Structure 1
Amino acid sequence: LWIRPDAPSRCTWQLGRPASESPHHHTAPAKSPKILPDILKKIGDTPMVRINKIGKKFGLKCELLAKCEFFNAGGSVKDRISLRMIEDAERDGTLKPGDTIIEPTSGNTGIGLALAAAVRGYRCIIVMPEKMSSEKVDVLRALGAEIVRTPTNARFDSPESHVGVAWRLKNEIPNSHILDQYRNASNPLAHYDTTADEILQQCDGKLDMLVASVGTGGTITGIARKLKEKCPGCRIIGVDPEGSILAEPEELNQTEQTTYEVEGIGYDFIPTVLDRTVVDKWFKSNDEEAFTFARMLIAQEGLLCGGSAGSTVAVAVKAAQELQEGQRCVVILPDSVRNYMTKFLSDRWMLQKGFLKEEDLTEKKPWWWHLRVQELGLSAPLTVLPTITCGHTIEILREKGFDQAPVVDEAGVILGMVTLGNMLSSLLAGKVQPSDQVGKVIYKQFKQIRLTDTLGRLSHILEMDHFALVVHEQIQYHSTGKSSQRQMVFGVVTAIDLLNFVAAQER
């Protein structure tokens, strides 16, 4: 009854057999029209870009090319299989308009299927592990797909695994089908028909290697099968995060931790779709190097790719040392950075997970990074009320030779800060009159900072707020059971002042 994903493959493919015996319906890469009737046709024909800086940093000699699969409609390499699966199910007559699609997946296939359903009108229910980022959840919500989260540490064949939940949901919902990516032949077939043909046409046939991360296994299986059928000289390199058992031989998989922060790759079972026989070698990868390489890719090549691309490049820079000049290597970058915006892209999260250490972050910063804000020539001899009139503020600011002053009330509550030039511009434009209160022109937001903080902290703060107020806090008492507090401003600092101080110190 239950079609488990760990069953051995029933296929009989082997090298050299002509395509005419294939039981599957093969289609060549279609030529895109002048205008595509629907967004679903914007899948495929992705570019192959040359890597320039990451390779030389590690002494790589071969031409390293990256398959930017994050430019697809859904921003992932899992839009191909979604489209192919939907098309095959529709052509088989299994799926009709208004039917329900249940897919246990890691979100990328879920996003692709949600997009397909929104375009074509299906009820899409997505079952995914809990550890996936909330970005995918939000995008799915906007696409009108129903989400079901499942525990991360649940064994694949357990009752509450993502596949198990999806299967029992299919068992109980009427007119519901599962296009299971772990077992459907359409998954590897999509790559076999489009991804491999695209690669061979774009690279002019000649290449010596290919590196691809492994989830469901189609992304590597189809490409490897087509390449070995056409260009067997290519070495197929697989990747697998620590804690997963996809990589072989087995002793490579002996590790204590079963959970990893990297997403979209690695599983505790061997998929039925996967064909490990066409894999020339396997590598293990960890979160730290993967995210670091993803950040390096973003910062030095402009490829806005996710963690899996980082893992792929980290493994490639190791595996491809054997290659010499004139030989070509290819890497498959699954998805975009969009799915990981608050994840590894955030320095906060990296430091919280420990994947980045303060020494690694600070060793490359300028010489003024560790200096305190105390080193600045900050000052703020005066302040004004928020109810004060505009012309009054103008005249008083000129009375004492300042162009800006903090705004504070009688109770000591800081309201913001106002600048002379902005007030003058507002008066000239007629937006305010001298008798009007400064509330129309006041800058009512700022960041409260302390003298003890370094200039690096100030720089990190100024990326969010223009003005930072250097303040101190004193607490005064009447019997030591009767407390009172107040804060007591010093000067107004901006990136302008910081850079002026840096320039003055340099000269």
Structure 2
Amino acid sequence: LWIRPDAPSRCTWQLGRPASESPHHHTAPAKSPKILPDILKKIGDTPMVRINKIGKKFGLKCELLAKCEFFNAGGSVKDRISLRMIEDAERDGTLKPGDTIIEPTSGNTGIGLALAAAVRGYRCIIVMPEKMSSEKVDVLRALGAEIVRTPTNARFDSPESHVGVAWRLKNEIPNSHILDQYRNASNPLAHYDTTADEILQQCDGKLDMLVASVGTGGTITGIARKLKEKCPGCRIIGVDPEGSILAEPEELNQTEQTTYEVEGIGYDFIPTVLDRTVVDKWFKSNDEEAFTFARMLIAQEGLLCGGSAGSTVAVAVKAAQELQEGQRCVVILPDSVRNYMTKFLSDRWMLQKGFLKEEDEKKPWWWHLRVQELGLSAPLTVLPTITCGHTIEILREKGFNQAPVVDEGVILGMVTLGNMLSSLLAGKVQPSDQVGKVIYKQFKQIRLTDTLGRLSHILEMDHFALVVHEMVFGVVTAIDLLNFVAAQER
């Protein structure tokens, strides 16, 4: 017992077949009630938002639209296929109450399934590649799903693959089923019945082009089939990452790299649910395009979305160049920034992985300069063992507003006149009390030879930044940096 995820499709559908000839149970989109019975009803009806800036930055004549799927309950487009697959299984009588659900996944399907299982009371085991983000793990574990990892770069054939291991676990566990998002008709059917109807209804039937990145392929297949039926003039454009085999012709697929950073799209095999015949043209994207463009979606359009979305738009600005005014282009945005918090959203990760060259220029004049250009003054020291009011006496008598608290030489912190006074007036501290009650413990250290941009970073975390010997030579805050930049401004 193992079923091939790459096994060729037995589906007899082809363009022009009546909705009557279909053997499948179709679900019509329904109105949402005033009060939702459970969170699973919050899946679907995702908004179609206009891309106002990015489209014109690249000179698109057409209308650039984005179907934002990260507004689903689990926060990904996978929440759709997870509910549907479950619901249908329940109708088959295959999925029984208290039963175990096992799935191989990029993790979005895993999160949608763990969510639905949490609500409906199913045990859920998720098998995902080791590449996938820990944020996904935190969300899954929080939903109460059991988690197994498989090595990325492990062939889909090998016993170590996520699909293979999923099956090996299914065989060893009683009442355990694999819904199999790669072979399940529910995956593309979810999109055929719901997502496509939504895209059409929202656009009033008028649609020139659709751009979608490709995972298992249920999204692009499901959408494209119904689009080819109800809006045949629409060009279907698929997006495949460099290193995958999904794109046509095979020539586009020839590549050096095997594994890549972008999560959720591309595979080393051709999924059953994937119908490559309805994709009019394919495009290859890379990790850099994806992360640059995703960050661009966030900063420009204010859409908090994942990397695959970035690939999708990155290709969209190219593929939609042919189009001209009055025509519209729809883009699929699969998931949210939540999964990627410590990866592409993090600057340090972008650097460490070499996507952001430090060269890539946009920063102001003051960015490169020494802190020494600021004009500081060495503040008075003090012991942690001093008493509050006494420090007031020293501060006013020396005419200082703040002192760094240094140890019998470990810098312990900072105490300021204003917070001392404020703390006393509220009765929060006594003049006989230890200074450690009101002390500011958190600060960061800098060299006089450090750059102003470094300081700009440090001040995004801490309020105080002390310039110190390689002995405090000065205390710097954002306000000082402002006083400098603005003084040098006029």
Same fold, judged at TM 0.5 (above): yes
SS of equivalent to 2:317: helix
* CA shift for structure 1 position 432: 1.2
Answer yes or no: is the 8 Å Cα contact 1:238–1:283 preserved in 2: yes
* CA shift for structure 1 position 15: 1.3
Partner of 1:481: none
Answer yes or no: is the 8 Å Cα contact 2:379–2:402 preserved in 1: no
Cα distance between partner residues in 2 of 1:424 and 1:82 = 58
Cα distance between partner residues in 2 of 1:427 and 1:347 = 42
SS of equivalent to 2:359: helix
Answer yes or no: is the 8 Å Cα contact 1:102–1:177 preserved in 2: yes
Partner of 1:273: 273
Partner of 1:26: 26
Moved >3 Å (runs of 4+): none
Partner of 1:478: none
Cα distance between partner residues in 2 of 1:414 and 1:105 = 49
* CA shift for structure 1 position 390: 1.1
SS of equivalent to 2:448: coil
* CA shift for structure 1 position 380: 2.0
SS of equivalent to 2:305: coil
Cα distance between partner residues in 1 of 2:263 and 2:281 = 22
Percent identity of paired positions between Structure 1 and Structure 2: 100
* CA shift for structure 1 position 286: 0.5
* CA shift for structure 1 position 500: 0.5
Answer yes or no: is the 8 Å Cα contact 1:81–1:186 preserved in 2: yes
Cα distance between partner residues in 2 of 1:457 and 1:71 = 36
Cα distance between partner residues in 2 of 1:111 and 1:375 = 51
* CA shift for structure 1 position 357: 0.3
TM-score (norm 2): 0.99
SS of equivalent to 1:323: coil
Answer yes or no: is the 8 Å Cα contact 1:387–1:438 preserved in 2: yes
Cα distance between partner residues in 2 of 1:248 and 1:339 = 29
User: Deviations for 1:307-356, whole angstroms, at most 9, x for unmatched residues?
Assistant: 00000000000000000000000000000000000001111011111111
Cα distance between partner residues in 1 of 2:379 and 2:447 = 18
Answer yes or no: is the 8 Å Cα contact 2:379–2:400 preserved in 1: no
* CA shift for structure 1 position 71: 0.3
* CA shift for structure 1 position 252: 0.4
Answer yes or no: is the 8 Å Cα contact 1:418–1:443 preserved in 2: yes
Answer yes or no: is the 8 Å Cα contact 1:387–1:437 preserved in 2: yes
User: Deviations for 1:456-489, whole angstroms, at most 9, x for unmatched residues?
Assistant: 000100111100111003xxxxxxxxxxxxxx11
Cα distance between partner residues in 2 of 1:146 and 1:275 = 32
* CA shift for structure 1 position 247: 0.3
Partner of 1:484: none
Cα distance between partner residues in 1 of 2:328 and 2:379 = 66
Partner of 2:148: 148
Cα distance between partner residues in 2 of 1:86 and 1:130 = 26
Cα distance between partner residues in 1 of 2:14 and 2:363 = 55
2:331 aligned with 1:331:
yes
Which stretch of structure 1 is more off in the superposition, 443-452 or 305-314?
Answer: 443-452
Answer yes or no: is the 8 Å Cα contact 2:211–2:236 preserved in 1: yes
Cα distance between partner residues in 1 of 2:332 and 2:450 = 43
SS of equivalent to 1:128: strand
Cα distance between partner residues in 1 of 2:396 and 2:83 = 68
Answer yes or no: is the 8 Å Cα contact 1:416–1:445 preserved in 2: yes
Change (3 A) 1:381 1:13: closer
Partner of 1:364: 362
* CA shift for structure 1 position 431: 0.8
Cα distance between partner residues in 2 of 1:287 and 1:189 = 30
SS of equivalent to 1:457: helix
Answer yes or no: is the 8 Å Cα contact 1:380–1:405 preserved in 2: no
SS of equivalent to 2:36: coil
User: Deviations for 1:200-220, whole angstroms, at most 9, x for unmatched residues?
Assistant: 111111010000000000100
User: Deviations for 1:267-321, whole angstroms, at most 9, x for unmatched residues?
Assistant: 0000011000000000000000110000011001110000000000000000000
* CA shift for structure 1 position 2: 2.1
Cα distance between partner residues in 2 of 1:444 and 1:173 = 53
SS of equivalent to 1:269: coil
SS of equivalent to 2:364: coil
Answer yes or no: is the 8 Å Cα contact 2:306–2:336 preserved in 1: yes
Q: Residues 117-132 of structure 1 correspond to what in structure 2 (within 5 A)?
A: 117-132=117-132
Aligned length: 490
SS of equivalent to 1:399: helix
Cα distance between partner residues in 1 of 2:418 and 2:97 = 63
SS of equivalent to 2:351: helix
SS of equivalent to 1:210: strand
Q: Which blocks of at least 5 consecutive residues in structure 2 are unaligned?
A: none
Answer yes or no: is the 8 Å Cα contact 1:369–1:455 preserved in 2: yes
* CA shift for structure 1 position 180: 0.2
Cα distance between partner residues in 1 of 2:334 and 2:407 = 55
* CA shift for structure 1 position 19: 1.0
Cα distance between partner residues in 1 of 2:133 and 2:366 = 36
* CA shift for structure 1 position 98: 0.7
Cα distance between partner residues in 2 of 1:169 and 1:198 = 37
* CA shift for structure 1 position 16: 1.6
Cα distance between partner residues in 2 of 1:217 and 1:409 = 63
Partner of 2:85: 85
Match of 1:402 among 395, 400, 403: 400
* CA shift for structure 1 position 409: 2.1
Answer yes or no: is the 8 Å Cα contact 1:81–1:187 preserved in 2: yes
User: Deviations for 1:169-209, whole angstroms, at most 9, x for unmatched residues?
Assistant: 11111111100001010000000000000011111110100
User: Deviations for 1:223-271, whole angstroms, at most 9, x for unmatched residues?
Assistant: 0000111000100000000110000100100001111111100000000
* CA shift for structure 1 position 413: 1.4
Answer yes or no: is the 8 Å Cα contact 2:379–2:404 preserved in 1: no
Cα distance between partner residues in 2 of 1:437 and 1:7 = 73
Answer yes or no: is the 8 Å Cα contact 2:378–2:473 preserved in 1: yes
Cα distance between partner residues in 2 of 1:381 and 1:334 = 53
* CA shift for structure 1 position 391: 1.1
Answer yes or no: is the 8 Å Cα contact 1:125–1:146 preserved in 2: yes
* CA shift for structure 1 position 168: 1.1
TM-score (norm 1): 0.96
Partner of 2:260: 260
Answer yes or no: is the 8 Å Cα contact 2:26–2:193 preserved in 1: yes
SS of equivalent to 1:322: coil
Cα distance between partner residues in 2 of 1:432 and 1:154 = 62
User: Deviations for 1:349-372, whole angstroms, at most 9, x for unmatched residues?
Assistant: 111111110110xx0111000011
* CA shift for structure 1 position 381: 3.7
Cα distance between partner residues in 2 of 1:270 and 1:438 = 67
Answer yes or no: is the 8 Å Cα contact 2:379–2:475 preserved in 1: no
Answer yes or no: is the 8 Å Cα contact 2:2–2:164 preserved in 1: no
Cα distance between partner residues in 2 of 1:38 and 1:437 = 53
Q: Residues 408-423 of structure 1 correspond to what in structure 2 (within 5 A)?
A: 408-410=406-408, 412-423=409-420
Partner of 2:175: 175
* CA shift for structure 1 position 139: 0.3
2:480 aligned with 1:497:
yes
Cα distance between partner residues in 1 of 2:269 and 2:316 = 24
* CA shift for structure 1 position 378: 1.2
Answer yes or no: is the 8 Å Cα contact 1:106–1:129 preserved in 2: yes
Superposed CA RMSD: 0.7
Cα distance between partner residues in 1 of 2:432 and 2:100 = 65
Answer yes or no: is the 8 Å Cα contact 2:298–2:305 preserved in 1: yes
Cα distance between partner residues in 1 of 2:270 and 2:335 = 22
SS of equivalent to 1:66: strand
SS of equivalent to 2:25: coil
SS of equivalent to 1:20: coil
Q: Residues 84-483 of structure 1 correspond to what in structure 2 (within 5 A)?
A: 84-360=84-360, 363-410=361-408, 412-473=409-470
SS of equivalent to 1:359: coil
